[PDB]
Structures are given as structure tokens and as C-alpha cells.
């Protein structure tokens, strides 16, 4: 999948970035960093790694704003985290990552059970 393809290409740390983006609308490093609670600095560099791969695309405008979007179309509480692919999700992702068969939120890329991240 998109999630898998990235993984083959790069590290896991990158994969987490791609996930949040898939999770919500186009975001900025600040936002991707805020929800995740990771340094913005590391976030930016993760973006570039994926971008070469084309997991995401960037638009730069003439502070200046950068927007990041996943090139998914190209291919074709409220703060949980995954213990396997170390990905992360918020409440908006809880109503979608939740499962009745288990009564919990399941990852979306590595289907690992996620857990609230303090």
C-alpha cells in the first residue's frame, strides 16, 4: 500500500509523518508537529525524505506558508500512538481507527493497536 511502499523506501520515523497527513487534510510542519508532539525540525526533514519518494508534495507560497499533502491521488484523549510503527493519531482518527471486534483503535498502516500518547 501507500503506507507500505514508503516503509520499504525509508525508515519508520518517516512513516509516522505520512500517517498523520493521511489522517487529516493538508497540514504544515508546525501542525504535523503539534498534533504529533515531535520537533518541527525533525518533521521537516522527514517530509523531504518522503517527498523524494512522492509520498507527499509541497507547495511553497511567497510568514511564508508551506503546505504538505500526500500524493495519494497521485498513486491512484484525541491523541493516540501506535506501539509498532510508532505512528500517531488524534480524536478525528479515533472515530475511524476504532474497532468493535476489539473495542479499541487499530493502526491504519501496520494495523497495530494504538494507545493514548501523553
Amino acid at each position: 500500500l501507500l503506507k507500505f511502499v514508503v516503509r520499504g523506501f525509508y525508515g519508520g520515523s518517516f512513516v509516522l509523518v505520512l500517517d498523520a497527513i493521511l489522517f487529516h487534510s493538508v497540514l504544515a510542519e508546525d501542525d504535523l508537529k503539534q498534533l504529533l508532539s515531535i520537533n518541527k525540525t525533525e518533521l521537516g526533514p522527514l517530509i523531504a525524505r518522503l517527498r523524494s519518494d512522492r509520498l507527499i508534495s509541497i507547495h511553497k507560497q511567497r510568514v511564508e506558508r508551506v503546505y504538505y499533502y500526500v500524493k495519494y491521488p497521485h498513486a491512484i484523549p484525541n491523541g493516540y500512538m501506535c506501539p509498532i510503527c510508532l505512528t500517531k493519531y488524534t480524536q478525528l482518527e479515533a472515530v475511524q481507527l476504532l474497532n468493535f471486534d476489539r473495542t479499541e483503535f487499530l493502526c491504519s498502516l501496520c494495523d497495530e493497536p494504538l494507545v493514548e500518547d501523553d
Binding site: D30, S37, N39
Partner: protein, 120 residues
């Protein structure tokens, strides 16, 4: 110059409203110049008839408190724009920068540079 700097430093340390005479004693400097030049043109000196110091905030705790919580959670960027967006009351440009420096500490920098604030 020296006397004025001492007056400013004194008021800044002590930080209260005060007649010209009250200032002389603690700093021991008197001139007419102070009355009709220094303590009127000097930005740090706020006339309230007596002379006071330009406090960053009415209470120091109000912006520093939010900055402590924001560090426990969220991202450092947009310090003045995120602080003003937060409440109807408007935060003073200088009180913001001031609280942050007194509070600091050090900030995780990454190359212009992205700056993130973390607890020491």
C-alpha cells in the same frame, strides 16, 4: 547618562511608581533635566504625575503561565500570534518577548532557524 542609567536600573529592580525625590535617595540623583527631559522622553519611564517603570505585564504570572503549559503541550512557533489568537485580551509585544527571555532556558534550534522550546 550614568545617573539616568542608575535610575532606570533602580526602578527596574524595585519596579514601582515613585516621586522624583523618592528616586534620588535610592539612586541619589537629582536634576531639572530629569524632570523635563530624562523621565519624560525615556520609554522605560512611564508617567502615571510620579515616575514608574514600564512593567511587561500587570502580573508576571499571566503570560509565563501559558508559556509553561504550551511547552508541556503543543509547538513553540507563533509565540506572539498564537498568544494573541488565544484570548480576547491582547498581549503586549514587549511583555511576550520579555517573559520568554526571563523564562529561558534554551530552545531547540534547527536550520533562518525553526525554534522549539523545551524544559531545562
Amino acid at each position: 547618562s550614568s545617573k539616568l542609567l542608575w535610575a532606570t536600573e533602580y526602578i527596574q529592580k524595585k519596579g514601582k511608581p515613585v516621586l522624583v525625590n523618592e528616586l534620588l535617595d535610592y539612586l541619589s540623583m537629582k536634576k531639572d533635566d530629569k524632570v523635563i527631559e530624562l523621565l519624560k522622553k525615556l520609554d522605560r519611564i512611564e508617567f502615571d504625575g510620579t515616575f514608574k517603570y514600564l512593567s511587561t505585564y500587570d502580573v508576571h504570572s499571566p503570560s509565563e503561565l501559558l508559556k509553561l503549559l504550551r511547552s508541556q503541550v503543543t509547538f513553540k512557533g507563533i509565540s506572539c500570534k498564537d498568544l494573541k489568537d488565544g484570548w480576547p485580551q491582547c498581549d503586549e509585544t514587549i511583555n511576550q518577548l520579555e517573559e520568554d527571555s526571563k523564562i529561558l532556558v534554551l530552545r531547540t534550534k534547527k536550520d533562518r532557524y525553526v525554534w522549539y522550546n523545551s524544559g531545562g
